[PDB]
Structure 1
Amino acid sequence: FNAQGFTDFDSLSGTSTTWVNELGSVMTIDVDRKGGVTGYYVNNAPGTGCRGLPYDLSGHAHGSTIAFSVVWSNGIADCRSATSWAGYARKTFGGGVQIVTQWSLAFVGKAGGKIETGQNVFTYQY
């Protein structure tokens, strides 16, 4: 792969790439030829659980847009939580690459079922 060449999420078709957000959480995504997204997310987000373990990641990317989800369970830690990202590619004028996302986090607290929301921007890294 090359960030120079990056056109849209088609530029990933058949590539392995690592992406860090502003919280230092890292996803390592395998994009297949037909736009299927598999790999692992590492939460390193302060203030939150299940940090620094691999969590299975599945989604799809087409054109400028991408959606993917994690359930926070692998048989090691369970945070009783699932997270979903939808977003679009952004090409930096510096010739790097970004994914701008809204994430939804669903969990069941002492107060029962609840749904927290926010933004992550992931920057391509090697």
Structure 2
Amino acid sequence: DFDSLSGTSTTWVNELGSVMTIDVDRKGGVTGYYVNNAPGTGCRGLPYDLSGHAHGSTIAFSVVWSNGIADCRSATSWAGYARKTFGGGVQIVTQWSLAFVGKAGGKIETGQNVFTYQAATVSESLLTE
């Protein structure tokens, strides 16, 4: 249930190391940012604005790949559902669609990502875990 994230900020990591941090407001409005870490892609390593909406067990969100720093002239959107995992964990199973303009005109690709909730961590220092 994404309604229990109402007024929280949570971070989620997919199988390729890409990260999203999402703020879900009381109406289920989703804001935050996405850091792309996917091998073979541009617009890696810096925050891109993310927005969408969540209700019950389902969520949809999109990122346009332009942040004033690197513009990949592309758009991704995700939809997914929450599922609980063995001994207290939580994930979002998603399908994405990516749109862009190749030399050969428009193209669109799709794929799955599973995003795993990452609890906030505390280390001893910047130098030592």
Same fold (TM over 0.5): yes
Tell me if 1:57 matches 2:50.
yes
Displacement, 1:79? 0.6
Question: 3-state DSSP class of the match of 2:93?
Answer: strand
User: Which of the numbers 76, 79, 83 marks the counterpart of 2:72?
Assistant: 79
* Cα offset, 1:10, TM superposition: 1.0
Equivalent residue, structure 1, for 2:123: none
| Structure 1: gaps (5+ residues) | 1-7
Q: Give the 3-state SS of the residue equivalent to 1:68 in structure 2.
A: strand
- Please provide the CA RMSD for this pair: 0.6
Note the C-alpha offset of 1:94.
Answer: 1.9
Give me the TM-score of the superposition, normalised by structure 2: 0.90
Deviation of the 1:93 alpha carbon: 2.3
Structure with greater Cα Rg: 2
- Structure 2, unmatched stretches of 5+, are 119-129
Q: CA deviation at 1:53?
A: 1.2
Within 2, Cα distance between the matches of 1:11 and 1:121? 20
Please give the alpha-carbon distance, in whole angstroms, between the structure 2 residues aligned to 1:13 and 1:61. Answer: 10
Q: Deviations over 1:74-124 (max 9, x none)?
A: 111011100000000011122100000000000001111000100010000
Q: Percent identity?
A: 100
Q: How many residues align?
A: 118
Q: Which runs of 4+ in 1 moved over 6 A?
A: none
